[PDB]
Design a protein around this ligand. Structure first.
Ligand SMILES: Cc1cc2nc3c(=O)[nH]c(=O)nc-3n(C[C@H](O)[C@H](O)[C@H](O)COP(=O)(O)O)c2cc1C
Ligand code: SF4
Ligand code: SF4
Ligand code: SF4
Ligand code: FES
Ligand code: FES
Ligand SMILES: [Ca+2]
Ligand SMILES: [Cl-]
Lengths: 156, 907, 154
């Protein structure tokens, strides 16, 4: 049975004090629980709702609308690669192929060890330095298919 | 108000409306989906596109959405512009790209708005060659089925369920083209108004499971204008039949009452009509032998015993019609006619009537309730007794946003803007009950207290609004502070609304509400008073009057009465079963006229097979005093010729004739109605409730079957290849066939069903109304029996004393359930799952004192009978009080206000 | 940007530039940083307001415009980072200076740039009127050797 930790509860409450309607803290509330669980467990949706005083259907709609909010289990280090047009010209396709080979997975799934999850992302606002990828909260620029195997090792 | 120019032709429309609403009300046809006459305009599907020109010289205009565009003066628009037509067809094509090929196996076929618009847009050729998106469905309970594949993302369900009905379990999930509409998880929709989704959804995602079991297409349904019989609100319905079984109940638009929405009890609580244990032929009990008689034999034999009876008394029912109750009254005599209701229930019902008929305060109609700016509910759990009034109260509370938006000059149809301007701002609402209520979410305050304390609050509010009102003693300072907020809210209101009823089981709560309303009237306010009764014709029986069930039993008990003719009443819901059974066993003759198999029938000497609302015609009076007529949907003897199910008034009228002339007289309904208006002047409006049987439209009777009804020469071929003769109707203006009139422009007010060429969906009501969302073109059906009196009643000076817990005695608090409290609806099988499991509710402290916990079975004695029930913990319930499910078989509604004695842990 | 903007706000509040009675003016302003969750539609002005309120970022309809009824039904004004970052200089160097920054009808400077297999990809603060050719050749350094220009999105 999911139970919000006191720290998570206090974090959501602090966020509620920054807006008129407590509903405005829903997006961050989903991010807090995620930062502590990797994703938003199904039980969290109802718990967050009780804290914000909003229908659980509303909390679920926000989570299933925003892409970064994960409603399905994810690996320890999520890998997001820019698939937009500037990076398409730079050659993200090679980076995607390199990641798929070194990980033996396809965009959208996690590795058997549960260390990495390959997810395509939209523009990362750094096309002058593309191709671009983000592992965890770290940004990597000027990507080359040869550097992929090494970059992944750093995220033990 | 404003002059618009559509396709050259000039039209006068209301500038306050949108072009879609305006043009639809002009008879012009514009395809649409996201817009609903009650949910406002959002501009999502982009289907109502119309070309708009800046002036009369503009030849290159722009495509705008008619639903999101004001019908301003000097507006030049074209619906037939080629670009507009092409765009409107393209919108349908985009919706058809991912649409499933399941017309033959979907329950909206022939009643689907999407099918109607595809054809209206003239889109019959597919160019898309790619894959269609799929979605897995969910379980939504026992009434609504889910088929997300058939969705078009118009957002109507979420806007109705959440923004209108204030539900919290339906939502929109996902993004882009993977948008999903359903519950956050599999489970039963919790809204008491979830059924309206079946008519709101323009596709077949939400459907009626109660019908899906025995599903039939709309063109094969025999429909009749009827009034719902599950509570006292009197909503107009369109019951439909096929093969001799009630298949589905649809909403009949009454711009004065239910408009476009019904509640779950009335929409899914009709299965009792299709029970196979119902009486179908007259039966006589000779010792242990049962003999099926015919109508003629039954009348002769019964009249023979009645002719030699010392005193024949008659017991009526709030379920029976005005005509049926009157027929029994004439058969047994007014002095020997008894209302089958408990003394207390009758006192409360008569007090409620006196307030509405002699209080000098206007009683609002269901739709008018949505226009009050402050509401006080005293003791009435409306959501569970008059659900549709609770929906109306919700719309009234949302008025603050509408007022705030009007100040910013925002159009009334722009719902999104109105909601943003409003935020969590709402009109003042205060509810009082013995425990939690479903209206607590939108209520400013909920007073949970014993019925006596709830009444004291009313007397207190009245004294504060007018010192001349009786004052109350013992109000604690804390409560007084809360009372002041209510007083200022009602005092500050321009159109206050006081709502009470007889379901609380207290005469004082009705008197308190009368005092509060009188106080506001004295302060020169547009105050409104609403009283919620218990059954379809409770107010009608109240106006007619009669002795109580207790007095009727005493007659049979002293032996002064030898014959008792009971009419559509089980008697066990109004009196002790031990007393009723014993009293009925001392009567030489006991005749029961009911359409359902009741317990009292077991020891009845004769049982007359009466018809239900579906197989009968009559008049019922709602809580507001509106007399509405219901019409027979189908002939019960069409398929089974042996069936002899006759209307109760016809049975009783014929018996009275056989008793006086030894001859049977199956009269017409109009004759019985004329008798009621002549004998009872109070029930005189019932004559104008509906036209007589001689009414015709250009010589044509009104029709009950659609013009494409099928199976005429094969539906009864199994019984006989020789087609039977069309059942004939001498009681109403409706024909039991399609050879009649159902034109949207027919000068009538009773519409059996809504169909117009091109509009096969419920959206066809638009063509039967003066203005879309308004009233029926030639007036809404129904007549209010009484008008607001010139003078009012004196303040009631009887303030009760505060409730005091008494060791041993346990005050029974009334808990009502939309699913379970009503008698006939509980008989319906689909309701078994929705109905609550048996329970007794106790204050946490009282449970600790009795050393019992949740689930513990407890034994208690009422009428010399030990009953065991699982204990449920109710924190809101005050100590000294026990909670029982009123109406649930065993717990008679009369138990409200009574006391349990030996309450202890069972075994 | 999040950690940097939050530190800047903390530094400003300490200096008394944000908070209550700013610069002894009686003006009370509180600044908050709201982080998003992935959707691009949130950029649309009305969608931003809905997202800020913790709702699905579905755009709204105008009229009414956010000016009268926007965030929580209150007067609201949405502006881009660059638009707001141009204000400080105008109130410090004067309106005349801003109008004479260039001679283009679009007054002021703009962070313009070129990307996509160019020798020097990046952005440069340039006045309106600089032809795309100048940005591509003088700054971007032209196409990378071996590549010929076919098209360009402005
Ligand atoms: C789909 C869409 C995405 C947008 N994304 C952004 C964005 O990321 N940033 C932005 O400043 N404006 C964005 N806009 C424009 C905003 O709606 C709005 O015009 C802007 O925030 C205000 O411009 P200004 O304040 O510089 O005049 C977007 C508009 C649309 C239709
Ligand atoms: S929803 Fe309408 S169009 Fe779609 S399959 Fe069902 S009947 Fe056909
Ligand atoms: S389920 Fe029905 S009402 Fe809801 S979006 Fe789909 S088609 Fe519209
Ligand atoms: S509110 Fe009463 S009359 Fe109306 S549908 Fe429900 S049960 Fe029937
Ligand atoms: S397209 Fe990759 S950062 Fe912009
Ligand atoms: S009905 Fe007008 S946009 Fe949908
Ligand atoms: Ca009849
Ligand atoms: Cl008190």
């Amino acid at each position: 049975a999911f139970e919000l930790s006191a720290a998570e509860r206090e974090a959501i409450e602090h966020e509620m004090h920054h807006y008129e309607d407590p509903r405005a803290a829903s997006i961050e509330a989903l991010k807090i629980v995620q930062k502590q669980r990797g994703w938003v467990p199904d039980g969290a949706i109802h718990a967050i709702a009780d804290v914000l005083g909003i229908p659980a259907s509303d909390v679920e709609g926000v989570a299933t609308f925003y892409s970064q909010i994960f409603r399905q289990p994810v690996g320890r280090h999520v890998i997001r690669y820019c698939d937009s047009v500037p990076c398409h010209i730079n050659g993200y396709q090679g980076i995607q192929a390199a990641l798929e080979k070194k990980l033996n997975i396809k965009p959208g799934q996690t590795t058997f060890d549960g260390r990495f999850t390959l997810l395509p992302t939209c523009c990362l606002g750094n096309c002058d330095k593309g191709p671009m990828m983000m592992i965890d909260e770290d940004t990597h620029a000027h990507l080359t298919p040869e550097a992929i195997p090494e970059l992944l090792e750093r995220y033990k | 108000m404003a002059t618009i120019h559509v396709d050259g032709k000039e039209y006068e429309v209301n500038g306050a409306d949108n072009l879609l609403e305006a043009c639809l009300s002009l008879g012009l046809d514009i395809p649409y989906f996201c817009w609903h006459p009650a949910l406002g305009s959002v501009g999502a599907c982009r289907q109502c596109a119309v070309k708009q020109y800046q002036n009369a010289e503009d030849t290159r205009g722009r495509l705008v959405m008619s639903c999101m565009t004001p019908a301003s003066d000097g507006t030049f628009i074209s619906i037939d512009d080629e670009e507009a037509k092409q765009f409107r067809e393209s919108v349908v094509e985009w919706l058809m790209t991912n649409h499933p090929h399941d017309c033959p196996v979907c329950e909206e076929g022939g009643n689907c708005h999407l099918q109607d618009m595809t054809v209206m847009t003239g889109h019959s050729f597919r160019r898309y060659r790619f894959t269609k998106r799929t979605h897995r469905n969910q379980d939504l309970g026992p009434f609504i089925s889910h088929e997300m594949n058939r969705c078009i993302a118009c957002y109507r369900c979420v806007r109705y369920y959440k923004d209108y009905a204030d539900g919290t379990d339906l939502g929109v999930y996902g993004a882009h083209d993977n948008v999903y509409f359903g519950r956050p998880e599999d489970g039963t929709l919790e809204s008491e108004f979830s059924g309206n989704l079946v008519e709101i959804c323009p596709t077949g995602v939400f459907t009626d499971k109660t019908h899906s079991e025995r599903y039939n297409r709309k063109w094969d349904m025999q429909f009749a204008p009827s009034i719902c019989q599950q509570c006292s609100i009197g909503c107009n319905i369109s019951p439909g039949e096929r093969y001799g079984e009630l298949r589905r109940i649809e909403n009949r638009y009454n711009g004065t009452v239910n408009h476009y929405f019904l509640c779950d009890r009335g929409r899914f609580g009709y299965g009792y009509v299709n029970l196979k244990d119902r009486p179908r032929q007259p039966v006589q009990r000779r010792g242990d032998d049962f003999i099926t008689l015919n109508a003629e034999q039954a009348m002769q034999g019964a009249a023979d015993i009645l002719r030699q009876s010392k005193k024949v008394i008659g017991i009526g029912s709030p379920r029976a019609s005005v005509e049926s109750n009157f027929a029994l009254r004439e058969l047994v005599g007014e002095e020997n006619f008894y209302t089958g209701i408990a003394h207390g229930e009758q006192e409360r019902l008569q007090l409620a009537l006196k307030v509405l008929r002699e209080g000098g305060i206007y009683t609002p109609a269901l739709r008018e309730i949505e226009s009050y700016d402050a509401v006080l509910v005293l003791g009435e759990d409306v959501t569970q007794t008059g659900a549709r009034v609770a929906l109306a109260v919700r719309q009234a509370v949302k008025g603050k946003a509408r007022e705030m938006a009007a100040a910013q000059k925002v159009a009334d149809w722009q719902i999104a803007a109105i909601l943003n301007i409003g935020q969590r701002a709402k009109h003042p609402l205060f509810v009082t009950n013995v425990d939690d209520t479903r209206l607590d979410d939108i209520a400013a305050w909920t007073y949970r207290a014993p019925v006596e304390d709830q009444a004291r609050l009313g007397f207190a509010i009245a004294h504060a609004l007018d010192n001349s009102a009786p004052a109350v003693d013992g109000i604690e300072p804390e409560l007084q502070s809360k009372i002041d907020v209510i007083v200022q809210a009602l005092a500050g209101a321009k159109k206050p609304l006081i709502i009470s009823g007889t379901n609380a089981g207290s005469l004082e709560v009705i008197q308190a509400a009368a005092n509060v309303a009188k106080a506001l009237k004295g302060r020169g306010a547009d105050v409104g008073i609403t009283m919620i009764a218990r059954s379809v014709n409770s107010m009608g029986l109240g106006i007619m009057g009669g002795g109580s069930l207790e007095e009727a039993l005493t007659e049979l008990e002293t032996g002064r009465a030898d014959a008792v003719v009971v009419l559509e009443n089980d008697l066990h819901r109004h009196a002790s079963a031990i007393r009723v059974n014993a009293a009925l066993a001392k009567a030489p003759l006991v005749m029961v006229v009911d359409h359902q198999r009741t317990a009292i029938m077991e020891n009845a000497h004769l049982v007359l097979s009466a018809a239900s609302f579906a197989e009968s015609d009559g008049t019922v009076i709602n809580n507001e005093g509106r007399a509405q007529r219901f019409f027979q949907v189908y002939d019960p003897a069409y398929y089974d010729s042996k069936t002899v199910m006759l209307e109760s008034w016809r049975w009783l009228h014929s018996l009275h004739s056989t008793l006086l002339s030894r001859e049977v007289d199956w009269t017409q309904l109009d004759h019985v109605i004329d008798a009621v208006v002549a004998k009872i002047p109070e029930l005189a409006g019932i004559k104008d409730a509906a036209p007589d049987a001689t009414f015709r439209i250009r010589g044509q009777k009104l029709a009950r079957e659609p013009h494409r009804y099928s199976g005429r020469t094969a539906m009864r071929a199994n019984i006989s290849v020789h087609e039977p003769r069309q059942p004939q109707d001498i009681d109403t203006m409706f024909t039991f066939s399609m050879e009649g009139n159902n034109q949207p422009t027919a000068h009538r007010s009773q519409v059996p069903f809504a169909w117009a060429p091109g509009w096969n969906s419920p959206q066809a009501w638009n063509k039967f109304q003066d203005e879309v969302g308004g009233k029926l073109r030639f007036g809404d059906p129904g007549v209010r029996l009484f008008e607001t009196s010139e003078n009012g009643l004196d303040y009631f000076t009887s303030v009760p004393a505060r409730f005091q817990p008494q060791d041993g005695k346990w005050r029974i608090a009334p808990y009502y359930h939309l699913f379970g409290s009503d008698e006939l609806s509980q008989r319906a099988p689909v309701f078994q799952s929705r109905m609550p499991q048996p329970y007794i509710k106790l204050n946490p402290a009282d449970a600790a004192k009795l050393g019992v916990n949740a689930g513990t079975r407890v034994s208690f004695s009422y009428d010399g009978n030990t009953v065991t029930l699982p204990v449920e913990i109710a924190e809101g319930l005050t100590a000294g009080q026990v909670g029982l499910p009123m109406g649930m078989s065993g717990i008679a509604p009369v138990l409200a206000g009574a006391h349990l004695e030996d309450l202890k842990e069972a075994q | 940007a999040a950690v940097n903007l939050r530190r800047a706000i903390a530094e400003a509040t300490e200096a008394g530039l944000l908070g209550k009675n700013i610069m002894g003016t009686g003006f009370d302003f509180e600044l908050f940083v709201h982080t998003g969750a992935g959707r691009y539609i949130c950029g649309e002005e009305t969608a931003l307001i809905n997202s800020l309120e913790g709702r699905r970022a579905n755009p709204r309809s105008k009229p009414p415009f956010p000016a009268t009824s926007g965030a929580w039904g209150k007067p609201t004004c949405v502006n881009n980072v660059e638009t707001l970052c141009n204000v400080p200089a105008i109130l410090a160097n004067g309106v005349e200076w801003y109008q004479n920054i260039s001679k283009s009808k679009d007054a002021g400077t703009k962070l313009m740039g070129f990307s996509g297999r160019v020798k020097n990809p990046g952005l440069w603060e340039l006045p309106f009127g600089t032809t795309a050719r100048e940005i591509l050749e003088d700054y971007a350094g032209g196409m990378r050797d071996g590549l010929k220009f076919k098209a360009w999105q402005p």
